From a paper:
Pleckstrin is an intriguing platelet protein that appears to be involved in reorganization of the cytoskeleton, as well as attenuating various signaling pathways following platelet activation. On cloning pleckstrin, two internal repeats consisting of approximately 100 amino acids including 30 identical residues were identified at the N- and C-termini of the protein. The domain structure consists of a seven-stranded anti-parallel β-sandwich that is closed at one end by a C-terminal alpha helix and remains open at the other end, where several variable loop regions are located. Previous studies have shown that phosphatidylinositol 3,4-bisphosphate [PtdIns(3,4)P2] binds to C-PH much more firmly than other phosphoinositides and that IP6 is a potent inhibitor of pleckstrin-phosphoinositide interactions.
Ins(1,2,3,5,6)P5 was bound to C-PH in the β1–β2 loop region (residues 253–264 and 277), making numerous interactions through all but one of its phosphate groups. The only phosphate group that does not interact with any residues of C-PH is that in the 1-position of myo-inositol. The 2-phosphate is the only phosphate that adopts an axial position. This configuration is strongly stabilized through interactions with the side chains of R264 and K253. The 5-phosphate of Ins(1,2,3,5,6)P5 interacts with main chain atoms of H256, R257 and N260 (water-mediated), as well as the side chain of R257. Regardless of its source, Ins(1,2,3,5,6)P5 binds specifically in the phosphoinositide binding cleft of C-PH making numerous interactions with residues known to be involved in binding PtdIns(3,4)P2.
Author numbering: 241 to 302, 311 to 347
């Protein structure tokens, strides 16, 4: 879990139970492929981490610039980028890491 950082930046993430959206900082690493997320300063312990090998990442039509990751074991993460370019860049990086 300590490798080179492939991409980082903030995204809004939906919580599972109450469905609110919160800004978190995300960091994608390889070997193994994982997406960790943090408090938006990136200063504290990670909040969580998503194992990406074999995941499905999909752009979701409209909340704007939505996309979803479903891990290989069927855990869903619903995310929103601040711009269409950032959704396109995150999907391409997760799809390449997921191989
Ligand atoms: O750990 P805290 O209390 O800050 O909670 C997160 C969300 O809980 P709430 O934001 O209090 O509703 C949470 O959403 P819901 O099920 O929407 O209540 C979300 O599932 C949970 O996600 P992870 O633990 O990362 O899976 C908590 O959100 P994060 O702080 O982004 O971790």
């Amino acid at each position: 879990f300590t490798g080179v950082i492939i991409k980082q930046g903030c995204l809004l993430k939906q919580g599972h139970r109450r469905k609110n959206w919160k800004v978190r900082k995300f960091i994608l690493r390889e070997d193994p492929a994982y997406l960790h997320y943090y408090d938006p300063a990136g200063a504290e312990d990670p909040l969580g981490a998503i194992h990406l090998r074999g995941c499905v990442v999909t752009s979701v039509e409209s909340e704007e610039n939505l996309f979803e990751i479903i891990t290989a074991d069927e855990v869903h993460y619903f995310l929103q980028a601040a711009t269409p370019k950032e959704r396109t860049e995150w999907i391409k990086a997760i799809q390449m890491a997921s191989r």
